[PDB]
Amino acid sequence: MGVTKTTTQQGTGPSPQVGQTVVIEYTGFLKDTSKPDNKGAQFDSSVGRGDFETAIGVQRVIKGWDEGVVSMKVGEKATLDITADYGYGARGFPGAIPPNSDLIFDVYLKGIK
Amino acid sequence: MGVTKTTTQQGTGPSPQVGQTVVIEYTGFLKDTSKPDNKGAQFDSSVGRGDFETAIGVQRVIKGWDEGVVSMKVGEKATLDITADYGYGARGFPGAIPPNSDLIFDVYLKGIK
């Protein structure tokens, strides 16, 4: 239950494998179960900044992204519900994410380099 | 070498010990040796918002803050040069801190609880 994925658009391209570079568009929200779609405050997004690129499965992003994205296919849009332990944990990230925050991300997998 | 400190204003109050809670004002920059004082892009600051309060020395914040702040006295202003090992490490934070980034922080210790 560290990360749960909900598919909102099915993709049919290849699925990322460990070490490949993925290209994603994303928006992140603090989870709040009292709010519509459990989405609390938006804390980050690639929208208007440029698609985000990272090698996947090699701990260069949070564990929920490493595990969620390798389960996706290019073209897929999904929402990842990530527990604090699979996100930024007790530290959080100062200025953006409080300690012990569950997270919701909309993720669109646009490519594998 | 994990964190090195330049004191820019001496403090004369008490110094924190491991496990105490500290009150700090800070600004964080990506290290960029092509820029004055090695300060690249500013990614976060408590200036204009409010002070950051945390238990110190117990891995609630990056190692460079744990060691750097413990070395300070209340009233002290210092600049910390923090290696990636002592900062946010291999993940960083998407759109703000790349993986394996050295960091520069201005820190100002304003209280111990």
Automatic annotation (TrEMBL), chains A, B:
Function, as annotated: PPIases accelerate the folding of proteins. It catalyzes the cis-trans isomerization of proline imidic peptide bonds in oligopeptides.
Top-level taxonomy: Eukaryota, Fungi, Dikarya, Ascomycota, Pezizomycotina
Record EC number: 5.2.1.8
Record GO cellular component, one term: cytoplasm
Keywords recorded for this protein, A-Z: Isomerase, Rotamase
Protein name: peptidylprolyl isomerase
Family of this protein: Belongs to the FKBP-type PPIase family. FKBP1 subfamily.
Reactions catalysed according to its record: [protein]-peptidylproline (omega=180) = [protein]-peptidylproline (omega=0)
Single GO term (MF): peptidyl-prolyl cis-trans isomerase activity
